[PDB]
Symmetry: D2
């Protein structure tokens, strides 16, 4: 029993880790990747998704769609201070690029080349998956949720058959890029607000509440080397670029690894605390847009929030993650 | 002859506008996309097709069914002007039963209408925009959700699009809300996106103009004069449609004679010489609790043309154009 | 029966006309004038109120208070493009200033001099009037409504005993200084919003809907001369130059041929309400809009509890009744000023 | 000795703060103004007077009754932390019966309390502000409506006022709303006006600090040690007051030991050396639907000082100061 899903993301060094976990995890069957604006322009995140796939020798298997370039009703805002100009700083990609297979999505779409990629391309693919699902189709979202909101404006009747597992928000701690809000929400608050009203089964699987406790320590670096060096002398430099920037910008000693925890939730939900509640997304605030405001501490519930991993959860997460990195090294 | 597309929410005004645009020799209608507004987008789709079939063009013009709701707000129907169907006042059962297949299904390679999707029109419009020598012309007389959706998908096309709209109020107050007009206030974010996109945008027919363009009794008799001799049934249909539209406008707004809004937009593309025009910066209120959709002007760089008035002669030129088309349709429908 | 009232205003050429009508009307008994920010700084509108009174030989009778210098939660915004730098352009005030009596308000307050004037001075005065009223005490407001809002934050229990007659807003036509809103509301929308929630009996007596139809035409000019020239040629010169300064600016900025005279219509409503159409309704004041703050939004195009009366039109006859009242007062002032 | 005024909404914390400020030798309290918040301003007035009478000062310190509602919003009481009276946990009937006349009535020339008006304190404060060598010190631990009202009346006095406040949350989340603290969110426009006015404004005691300042068991025993030998009844009263405050904080927010918020503000004026401090630009959310009153910082010109933490030693210094005052009050009550 393996779970069909799609990934929506903005790679992004976290997003790269998340793609590795999701694609190589036996529990998941990734149907496609759609990229979004966020960290970088959606053209760069598209490229970075493909690079990730090619590195792990899957760029010829998984279709990658290039989604929307800006939020519904706001201006784009890149995050180059964590991720670099390319969106995946710290490595030379020139080889990975030159040896890059054709994107399977072009075949699904019947396109000659990438210049024909359009933001809504993924719609028909996802609609087939949603139709085929016995209960609900699973999306893992770890960037802005513009793409999914765009989709549900086009296919509103599909909302009730979609389950979203997201890295988004902050509830019991403060924000990152703004005082009380998290990057993914605040770049398109209207998107998430639309989704939470749509009838989607929505889980905040990995808010900052969890992910700020999931740090790439030196012990984690040595366990990666232990699992990968014997098979394949990139991943380290990538997590180190991500380390230098998080120290530079936020004064974290060890950087949090956000997005994979979302994928981990779909793989292994038993390791997560969960509560149902009503989440309001601030869209009107001048300085607080994207705040995730909850009734927990009487509007109906519209979401599940995971505030903490059960003890054991951190180790379960790293075990899962080191294993996948091991398998990729073998290949 | 000017290639264009129509975006609309029929709607009795929108029906009049489709007739003018399709039969005007100056225009070449490439497609019709329908939007939410007056009614659900499924009803406005149906009503667009009905209009086309009545005027014997439902087999020529492709009709797309666009988005069912605004970008970030709830839908709000206008059944108190237009009825439950969106085109009250007539029995459509014949026009429906004798309805040709929609040419859009052929372009799209679809078996049937149940496969129509809101973004279907995108690729069609992109080809038109690419082919245009200067800019491609869209006439918009409903919510501008569809065009905003399009420009989120094809942002680089904005600079090659020219929009001619029935929207807004500038120097007079609103209709459905105190200071705002229906088409803007149902999706203010849409129009706001458009005005920021680089589109060449013209407020061709705000309430400022259209409230002076009334279906009087004189207008009704000139319609009969131009149509009865060729097609009594068409006369019956068009008159009952404008009368339903009359009763409701009296009921809801206390107008003696109802304004005919949407055709004026098409008239602008046909015959711009009859319109006053000024360039300015338009801000759309999106934050106001009671004033969202207000068109606020500096009368900040210019982002729009506003037409505040017809030149003297303009009203007669408009009605002549409109009566002529109704005459031509009567000839085709026959006796 | 003569009606006790207070004036709140920002003179301002209209406000000057309104003070003349109110002070000399036999139907009204003006207890005080409080000035507010708006047209000019509140210190200038204070001065201009006093000047008006001194011109009409009443600066020693009517106390003038100097109210709040800025809105509750927004920045001040002067209107010098209609009114000039002084707030009362078009005449030389240097004589009227030199011969200026002590302000009776200083006596009520027990103040040595004007340097002690404070925005909330008028509060205790108004509270006594409100307490003494049999039904409600009448305020005529023709500037920002900051002062009254400030008062009701201090004396909230007095709201139910206050009746306000205002020159404010636009309902069935568009605005002046912003597309859909009128100056007096948009300079302090929160103030009016507080008032409409407070329990005050509030009347929009003179929106732009009415006042844009109340123009200083040539016929009006000749009737002023007829009523004033025989008694006081200089007063004729002064009042005309004042309405002419107001004419040049309104033509310059808004392309009016003949300028509207706004604020006196509010006072006229208290004098003679029979000349006004009136309807009760719910008015929402836009406070959140970026470009539309101060809009007066109602149900009134179409066919929440009522919180206001709106006067959309004068009854036919109303314009002439207004000018008769106004020219009579200008006549009486001419008699008193003399040659 | 530092001349100051207290603005507050007692409130159990506010009561503790009044005790510290009035009995601290470093401070000279000129007056107390009460505000809406925890309870109606009439109740917080009463509670301020009660506090003063308990500590035998109700005949010395004038108490003004300020504004009953925010500038542009509806009042919102906090009876779930503080009770119906605003000072639950004890019987005040004796303290009330034996209550001296309010010195403010004498300053104002008023027959009785029914004549108290929200703006009464204005002229008093203006004299203090004028007399100050540099700036006059206000300690604010409720809504800041009164001070905002004052600065609308006396805008030129802003540059001569220094405010030390218990307000806000910066690096942690809020209490009564997800990302905002009670005192700010009940009148965000007030604080926003103040930060634009030219006031020297210090967030001396945000939740960042006060959530680390808990009434533990050790603190309870030090209170008994300092007070029981002089005044058993005062011991009973102060303990029941902190216990009422304990039960409610556990009930509502699941705190083991309740934070004591407002005195930390007064402590800052007494002893600023124990506080970390940084200058920054604070924006107050006024437009947000669910986030009004958020203190958003650039951590635009600086408009405030923020104290994010006590220096190590600071907690003990605070409690020493606080236990000492409670000791001295016990001596006087007997
Ligand atoms: Ca990401
Ligand atoms: Ca329409
Ligand atoms: Ca005025
Ligand atoms: Ca307090």
């Amino acid at each position: 029993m393996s779970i069909k899903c799609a990934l929506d993301c903005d790679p992004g060094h976290d997003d790269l880790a998340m793609i590795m976990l999701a694609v190589y995890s036996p529990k998941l069957d990734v149907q496609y990747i759609s990229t979004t604006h966020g960290n970088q322009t959606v053209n760069k995140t598209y490229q970075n998704a493909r690079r990730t796939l090619n590195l792990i020798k899957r760029a010829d298997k998984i279709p990658v769609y290039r989604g929307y370039s800006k939020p519904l009703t706001r201006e784009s805002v890149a995050c180059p201070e964590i991720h670099g100009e390319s969106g995946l700083g710290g490595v030379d990609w020139s080889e990975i690029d030159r040896t890059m297979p054709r994107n399977p999505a072009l075949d699904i779409l019947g396109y000659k080349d990438e210049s024909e990629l359009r933001p809504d391309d993924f719609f028909k693919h996802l609609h087939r998956l949603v139709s085929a699902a016995e209960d609900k189709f699973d999306i893992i979202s770890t960037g802005s949720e513009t793409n999914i909101a765009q989709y549900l404006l086009a296919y509103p009747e599909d909302a009730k058959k979609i389950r979203m597992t997201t890295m988004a928000g902050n509830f019991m701690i403060v924000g990152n890029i703004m005082p009380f809000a998290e990057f993914n929400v605040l770049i398109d608050p209207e998107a998430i607000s639309n989704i939470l009203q749509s009838g989607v089964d929505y889980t905040f699987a990995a808010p900052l509440d969890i992910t700020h406790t999931v740090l790439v320590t030196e012990k984690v670096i040595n366990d990666i080397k232990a699992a990968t060096e014997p098979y394949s002398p990139m991943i380290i430099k990538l997590l180190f670029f991500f380390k230098d920037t998080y120290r530079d910008v936020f004064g974290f000693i060890d950087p949090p690894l956000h997005d994979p925890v979302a994928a981990f939730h779909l793989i292994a939900p038993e390791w997560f605390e969960h509560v149902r509640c009503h989440v309001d997304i601030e869209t009107k605030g001048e300085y607080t847009y994207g705040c995730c405001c909850t009734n927990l501490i009487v509007k109906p519930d519209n979401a599940t929030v995971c505030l903490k991993l059960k003890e054991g959860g951190h180790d379960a997460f790293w075990n899962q993650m080191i294993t996948v990195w091991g398998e990729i090294a073998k290949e």
